[PDB]
Amino acid sequence: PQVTLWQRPLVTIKIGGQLKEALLDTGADDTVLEEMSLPGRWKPKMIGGIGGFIKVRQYDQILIEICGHKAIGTVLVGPTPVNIIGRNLLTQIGATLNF
Amino acid sequence: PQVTLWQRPLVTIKIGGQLKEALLDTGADDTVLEEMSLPGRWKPKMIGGIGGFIKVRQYDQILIEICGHKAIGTVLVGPTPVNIIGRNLLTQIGATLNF
Ligand SMILES: O=C1N(Cc2ccc(CO)cc2)[C@H](Cc2ccccc2)[C@H](O)[C@@H](O)[C@@H](Cc2ccccc2)N1Cc1ccc(CO)cc1
């Protein structure tokens, strides 16, 4: 998908048989995702960005469908108020930041 | 520039005659930036992202250079641990997320 910039590149991603609005964030390095029900192996950790640091669950190997395009990746599930398709997923769909 | 080196698209940016590392944050909507010196003509705003809410200074019309590309935009100055380049600047360099 080609996303210009006059709007947000949000996409109903499908992770853990679930569906939520995602926020393509080339700023983050992985795919964080508000807490939710996600079965699979995960590692507990804490990301520190703006405002403070939260807790997450590095879920490596999760099929996240972005815009209808299959894309597995590591989804860090934590108490984040949003979804973040970071580099770990911008490399699965083969994104290119051209300007 | 077309950047497909599946890596952090960072760029030495020049803001207020200064220089810091910028993290192309297509996830954010504007160009936040750690504390620094800007031209009187800003407005206080609070961003609430991961971990908590921080306070910045929405500076408008700041010649922020990205990778040597003269660009002006809204640079928020606050206690952020990074130079965030949100869409507000991804619209100046005509960025496009093709995947
Ligand atoms: O905390 C944010 N992280 C933190 C973060 C850390 C680690 C990961 C996983 O690797 C993902 C995100 C990033 C910006 C950042 C990176 C590094 C250091 C400091 C900041 C992100 O790249 C940005 O997109 C939003 C994500 C977001 C947006 C809305 C709601 C929740 C989360 N934020 C917060 C943010 C909010 C507003 C603006 C201005 O509009 C900018 C940033």
Curated annotation (Swiss-Prot), chains A, B:
Changing N88S: Confers resistance to atazanavir, indinavir and nelfinavir. Changing K20I: Confers resistance to lopinavir. Changing H69Y: Confers resistance to lopinavir. Changing V82T: Confers resistance to indinavir, lopinavir, ritonavir and saquinavir. Changing L10Y: Confers resistance to atazanavir. Changing T91S: Confers resistance to lopinavir, ritonavir and saquinavir. Changing L90M: Confers resistance to indinavir, lopinavir, nelfinavir, ritonavir and saquinavir. Aspartyl protease that mediates proteolytic cleavages of Gag and Gag-Pol polyproteins during or shortly after the release of the virion from the plasma membrane. Cleavages take place as an ordered, step-wise cascade to yield mature proteins. This process is called maturation. Displays maximal activity during the budding process just prior to particle release from the cell. Also cleaves Nef and Vif, probably concomitantly with viral structural proteins on maturation of virus particles. Hydrolyzes host EIF4GI and PABP1 in order to shut off the capped cellular mRNA translation. This is Protease. Changing I50V: Confers resistance to amprenavir, lopinavir and ritonavir. Changing L63T: Confers resistance to lopinavir. Changing L24I: Confers resistance to amprenavir, indinavir, lopinavir, ritonavir and saquinavir. Changing I93L: Confers resistance to indinavir. Changing M36I: Confers resistance to nelfinavir and ritonavir. Changing D30N: Confers resistance to nelfinavir. Homodimer, whose active site consists of two apposed aspartic acid residues. The active site is at D25 (for protease activity). Changing I15V: Confers resistance to tipranavir. Changing F53Y: Confers resistance to indinavir, ritonavir and saquinavir. Changing I54V: Confers resistance to indinavir, lopinavir, ritonavir and saquinavir. Changing M36L: Confers resistance to ritonavir. The chain holds residues 489 to 587 of 1435 of the full protein. Residues 1-5, 49-55, 88-99 are annotated as: Dimerization of protease. Changing E34Q: Confers resistance to lopinavir.
